[PDB]
Structure 1
Amino acid sequence: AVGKNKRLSKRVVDPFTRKEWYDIKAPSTFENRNVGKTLVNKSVGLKNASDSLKGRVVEVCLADLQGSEDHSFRKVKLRVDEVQGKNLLTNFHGMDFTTDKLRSMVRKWQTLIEANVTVKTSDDYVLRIFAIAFTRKQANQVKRTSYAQSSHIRQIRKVISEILTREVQNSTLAQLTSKLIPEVINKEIENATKDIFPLQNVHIRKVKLLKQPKFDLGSLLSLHG
């Protein structure tokens, strides 16, 4: 907290005076469209602020973007693409679980089932989807455990693979997020796999973007308004 070797192998300026604030607007599918503000250096040509902004990522809880608390454990990543001025427009980037819920529902005496899939969406987006499921005690258990046989994991895992394949390849990322908000796909998986084993608390994990077509300016303009 004093001095050090200083192996160099005043002229100070204020950090904030040359800095400026920008607003973030969410895709119209999300409920609370206003997200927040981000700090930028002041706009100077030859490295305008626009070049620095486009490409940034904003990391926001889904409960924030909907308002209710039932979406606390989810957490969406948004990608900065278009700069409007004092307000920037962001396209969907990814969506994830908070580590706490994931670590909470991975308990003992119930093996998990993971289902990874890499799928092109309707339009051009190459995406990766994870699915996490946990075995459920039927409400008559006297055996203290609910292990599943590897045949059952094989069946459930495959079924989830085609379920995600259909639900992604059919509809675009906007419609995908529309299914993602009220987690209809989760209950769909639970119903489609109900005949194999109870399978408590299925969920969609780490909706991960892989590839995007060019820019599709019109898509962004339709997204925000």
Structure 2
Amino acid sequence: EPFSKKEWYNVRTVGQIVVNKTAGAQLGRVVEVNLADLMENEKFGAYNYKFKCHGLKLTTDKLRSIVKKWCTLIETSIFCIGFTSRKSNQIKKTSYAKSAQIKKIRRNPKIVACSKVFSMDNVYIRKVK
């Protein structure tokens, strides 16, 4: 029998982790959980947390989604991301920042009010180590 030696433990306690029964329980395990599950609210669903018996990270869905084709991506380092935004009256398709302008921009991110330097909308913290 393969599972007769297994014992279960506990860690919102968010779940259980199996472990071999002690012999002649070892538990620096890393557990990745969603911030929505921890806070029981779906408004935090776009985040992933790590706990060691640590760090966080934006979900892979959200990071790809917020990348737009005709703007400028700004990154720094705690990792931050940003994108130059459009405007209500703006007509030209592409809203890029100058190189000189970019260097100035380098639980809530309100970082945005840099609104005196350029128009920014998609500001997130995508990772903490």
TM-score over 0.5 for the alignment?
A: yes
Please state if 1:135 is matched with 2:84. yes
Tell me the equivalent position of 1:105. Answer: 66
Q: CA deviation at 1:15?
A: 2.3
Q: CA deviation at 1:73?
A: 1.0
**2:112 maps to which of 178, 190, 195:** 190
Structure index of larger Rg: 1
Q: Distance in 2 between matches of 1:134 and 1:110?
A: 6
Moved over 4 A (4+): none
Tell me the equivalent position of 1:152. Answer: 101
In the TM superposition, what are the counterparts of 1:78-117 in structure 2 within 5 Å? 78-80=51-53, 93-116=54-77
Tell me the equivalent position of 1:204. Answer: 125
Please state if 1:72 is matched with 2:59. no
In the TM superposition, what are the counterparts of 1:39-78 in structure 2 within 5 Å? 39-44=18-23, 46=24, 49=25, 52-53=26-27, 55-78=28-51
Q: State the aligned residue count.
A: 129
CA shift digits 1:32-86 (9 cap, x unpaired): 2x21000100123x4xx1xx21x11000011111111111111011011xxxxxx
Tell me the equivalent position of 2:14. Answer: 35
**Helix, strand or coil: the match of 2:43?**
helix
- What do you get for the CA RMSD once the two structures are aligned? 1.0
In the TM superposition, what are the counterparts of 1:158-197 in structure 2 within 5 Å? 181=107, 184=108, 186-187=109-110, 189-191=111-113, 193-197=114-118
Of Structure 1 and Structure 2, the greater helix share is in 1
Q: How does the TM-score come out when normalised to structure 1?
A: 0.56
Query: Between the two proteins, what is the percent identity of the paired residues?
Result: 52
Q: CA deviation at 1:112?
A: 0.5
Of Structure 1 and Structure 2, the greater strand share is in 1
**Helix, strand or coil: the match of 2:112?**
helix
**Helix, strand or coil: the match of 1:23?**
coil
Q: Distance in 2 between matches of 1:145 and 1:131?
A: 23
Tell me the equivalent position of 2:10. Answer: 23
Amino acid of the structure 2 residue aligned with 1:151: A
